[PDB]
Design a protein around this ligand. Structure first.
Ligand SMILES: [Mg+2]
Ligand SMILES: [Mg+2]
Ligand SMILES: [Mg+2]
Ligand SMILES: [Mg+2]
Ligand SMILES: [Mg+2]
Ligand SMILES: [Mg+2]
Ligand SMILES: [Mg+2]
Ligand SMILES: [Mg+2]
Ligand SMILES: [Mg+2]
Ligand SMILES: [Mg+2]
Ligand SMILES: [Mg+2]
Ligand SMILES: [Mg+2]
Ligand SMILES: [Mg+2]
Ligand SMILES: [Mg+2]
Ligand SMILES: [Mg+2]
Ligand SMILES: [Mg+2]
Ligand SMILES: [Mg+2]
Ligand SMILES: [Mg+2]
Ligand SMILES: [Mg+2]
Ligand SMILES: [Mg+2]
Ligand SMILES: [Mg+2]
Ligand SMILES: [Mg+2]
Ligand SMILES: [Mg+2]
Ligand SMILES: [Mg+2]
Ligand SMILES: [Mg+2]
Ligand SMILES: [Mg+2]
Ligand SMILES: [Mg+2]
Ligand SMILES: [Mg+2]
Ligand SMILES: [Mg+2]
Ligand SMILES: [Mg+2]
Ligand SMILES: [Mg+2]
Ligand SMILES: [Mg+2]
Ligand SMILES: [Mg+2]
Ligand SMILES: [Mg+2]
Ligand SMILES: [Mg+2]
Ligand SMILES: [Mg+2]
Ligand SMILES: [Mg+2]
Ligand SMILES: [Mg+2]
Ligand SMILES: [Mg+2]
Ligand SMILES: [Mg+2]
Length: 149
RNA sequence: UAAGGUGAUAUGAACCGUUAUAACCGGCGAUUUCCGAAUGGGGAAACCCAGUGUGUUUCGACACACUAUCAUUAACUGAAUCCAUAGGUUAAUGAGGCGAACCGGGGGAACUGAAACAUCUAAGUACCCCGAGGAAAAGAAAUCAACCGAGAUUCCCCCAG
RNA sequence: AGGGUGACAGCCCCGUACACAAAAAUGCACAUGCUGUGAGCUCGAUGAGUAGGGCGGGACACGUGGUAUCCUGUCUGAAUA
RNA sequence: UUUUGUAUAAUGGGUCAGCGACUUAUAUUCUGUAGCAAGGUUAACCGAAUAGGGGAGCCGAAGGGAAACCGAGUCUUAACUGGGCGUUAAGUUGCAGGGUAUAGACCCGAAACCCGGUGAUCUAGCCAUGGGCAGGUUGAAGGUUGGGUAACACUAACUGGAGGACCGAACCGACUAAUGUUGAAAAAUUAGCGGAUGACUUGUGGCUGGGGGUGAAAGGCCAAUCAAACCGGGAGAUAGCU
RNA sequence: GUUUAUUAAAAACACAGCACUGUGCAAACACGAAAGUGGACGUAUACGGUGUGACGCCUGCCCGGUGCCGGAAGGUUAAUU
RNA sequence: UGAGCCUUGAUGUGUAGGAUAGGUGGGAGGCUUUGAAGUGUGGACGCCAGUCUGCAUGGAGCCGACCUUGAAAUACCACCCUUUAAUGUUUGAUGUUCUAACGUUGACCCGUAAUCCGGGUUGCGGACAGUGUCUGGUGGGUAGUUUGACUGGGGCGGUCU
RNA sequence: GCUUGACUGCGAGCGUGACGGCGCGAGCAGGUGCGAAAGCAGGUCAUAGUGAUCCGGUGGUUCUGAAUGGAAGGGCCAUC
């Protein structure tokens, strides 16, 4: 009886080694005590599906993991404004909370559920990113100029 | 359909009817005790004894109906033992037994004949058993043929003692 | 035809030949209505513990014989247009 | 009737009447008869149904040889002077008949073998549940008391009531004789006889089924049947016999 | 005590006792294709089979034959291969 | 304790010789810091000459055309005849151990108000036992049968061409 | 003394048997032996010394050969 081993049997094989086992050994021990299952040339592809499918979903991720490290040295230059003053002390505003104010003039109608948003809340007069509020995804522009009096 | 009828041995009695519910004949209904597969349980067949549920101008008790077994299915329930399964309750469907022969299948003699007898014969007969049907079975070539060809099965006549 | 009728009846009676008959039920046939089953064309597929084998038996007219073929109780066991 | 042979005192028949035994089917051969004739004839079937169709086939016209093969010849043999079988001889289909074959095969008739059922209301054994044994005898163990024993033992009397115990009715049986023998009775009667608290007997019900049962064993009993029950079937077994 | 119901009641059968043998329990053995049942709700002081047949004195020699028991060296020896 | 087997490792004195020459092709040097040569030595072979090989120390050396010889190097390779070493593995035998088939007419639990059965748990046996097919033996336990004729009856005896 | 006629194929005609069969047999062909030759020889002076068939075995024989070629098997002759 040709069986495929579901686990290491000592004197036979190792997690798939199709061996010729006496039918009583398989019928009464290896199959009920789940060390094996018979080699029907469907189980040679159905639980060697763990040999086939769980291996076959690794060759394309091996190729898809090559196109992810392709966009690495593209940008490599960012407008960094937190100057290393008298020998490099951190006080400024670069990362992980909130930048809004002055580039709200940025296209055609959006909502406030699409902004990605690092620390500098822009109490330093500059131009940073807002989403102005109606619609789901598209970018938005609305400019007003307060006439002083 | 009718002028005659109330089956027979089998008269008589008491009646029915005669121009259309007398009787007679036929179709479709209806009633159809008890036993018997007998099926509510039992049983020495035609008897005994229940249970549940419905109803009943006397509350002494009555009337009706249902209640077998197996299979299949489904629903609800539910062990050892977590799920689960077994199991259990109900409901629905079907079966059950009988019957002459023919039919298919499962089993299968001996007398006898061989001028004895064992191989052989009788004979896959008789008989037992299961199952089915109006017929059953068989049946659409993994068949024959003989280099030509035929073209499922079954039955009859030959081939041929 | 046949059966009766006081002995043998074509013409006495019942019948017979022939021609008619159905409220109702029901069958075998045709057409049709409904609900089931899916024809026709294309590429494909083509029945494995099986065929075959060993042992034992049975069936084939054929008694194991030089005995093909079929069935299979037992042990085995292919090929796949 | 059977026999060498029967008045035979060998068989059979009381008599009458009625019934009672060489058949039928299909094949084969011979005879007769009819038809056709080197041809004869169809079978199933179709059907215009005893017609007609249908010639599938069958027999015949050629044999010889194991056969291939040859062919009025052939085989034998290396081959025949030869020898064997053949050639010089009309068959065929009906009808009728004589025989043969297969079938029950002229009729009757076994003992028996096999298959499937029915039977333990008789009997045999067992199981369960109930009943029966008048009356009279015998007097075991044990017990009590007294004696006796160092104590046991042992012993006498009284008691006690054992036993496939004794005598003997019911009850169960059946040793002898006679009767009876077409009986009163398909096993009894009569006079006697054995057992009679037991391995007893009996009632009711139950179980064991035929090569099986049961058997204190006789091949005994299993429904008046037993060296293989009864009933039905195979079955008209077979019968060189009467 | 039992027996040939229906020609034999006996010296026959049985019997207590004796012996041999088997049987370790899912016992041997028996009825059963089998399940199972009896043996036995018993367990070797038990059960089955065989023979002998109270009791008393006894039961002698023969293992070549046949059987049974045990042995397993070698010889021969089946299916199978 | 018996045999097979891919693959590699090892078995080969006519004499010519520095001495343990099966053969053809492939060739001018292979092996040696994942370790050389000169020594000791384990278990084998042995024509007694020395080869094969394990292990330890060792640290820069063993081996050619050779002079000879029908054949010239285990200098690297490749195929393969004679020879015997070794496993994975192949099937053989006996014994031991195991458990997971199988058995349980052991215990407990549930089905289940059940000494049946089944399931479960566990223990004990355990690849035995037991059963099927095949097979030799035994087998009046049972069955079917045979066991001649002549014959001054039959049998005994004799005879049978 | 020499030899294999204890030949092969046949066989007119006879004898004897219910039959199966058994027996006698001149002569013909072929090929042998002995004899100078005529001739003789197909076992032994004769009459006993034997066993049907079936089933098979051996050898020979392209007789047959289940589509065809072969073979198996069968037949024929010899023989067990
Ligand atoms: Mg009832
Ligand atoms: Mg009832
Ligand atoms: Mg006979
Ligand atoms: Mg026979
Ligand atoms: Mg063609
Ligand atoms: Mg075939
Ligand atoms: Mg076979
Ligand atoms: Mg055959
Ligand atoms: Mg006389
Ligand atoms: Mg006279
Ligand atoms: Mg007189
Ligand atoms: Mg007389
Ligand atoms: Mg007289
Ligand atoms: Mg008389
Ligand atoms: Mg008369
Ligand atoms: Mg007989
Ligand atoms: Mg019988
Ligand atoms: Mg019967
Ligand atoms: Mg009695
Ligand atoms: Mg007494
Ligand atoms: Mg009286
Ligand atoms: Mg008296
Ligand atoms: Mg008395
Ligand atoms: Mg006697
Ligand atoms: Mg009687
Ligand atoms: Mg008899
Ligand atoms: Mg009958
Ligand atoms: Mg008769
Ligand atoms: Mg007495
Ligand atoms: Mg008597
Ligand atoms: Mg008497
Ligand atoms: Mg005695
Ligand atoms: Mg003695
Ligand atoms: Mg012995
Ligand atoms: Mg006998
Ligand atoms: Mg005689
Ligand atoms: Mg002489
Ligand atoms: Mg051929
Ligand atoms: Mg052929
Ligand atoms: Mg031949």
């Amino acid at each position: 009886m040709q069986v495929i081993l579901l686990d290491k049997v000592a004197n036979l094989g190792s997690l798939g080694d199709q061996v010729n086992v006496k039918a009583g050994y398989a019928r009464n021990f290896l199959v009920p005590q789940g060390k094996a299952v018979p080699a029907t040339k469907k189980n040679i592809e159905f639980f060697e599906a763990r040999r086939a499918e769980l291996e076959a979903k690794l060759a394309e991720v091996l190729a898809a993991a090559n196109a992810r490290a392709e966009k690495i040295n593209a940008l490599e230059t960012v407008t960094i404004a937190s100057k290393a003053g008298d020998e490099g002390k951190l006080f400024g505003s670069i990362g992980t909370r909130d930048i809004a104010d002055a580039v709200t003039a940025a296209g055609v109608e959006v909502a406030k559920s699409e902004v990605r948003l690092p620390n500098g809340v822009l109490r330093t007069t500059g131009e940073h990113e807002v989403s102005f509020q109606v619609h789901s995804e598209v970018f938005a522009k609305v400019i007003v100029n307060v006439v002083a009096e």
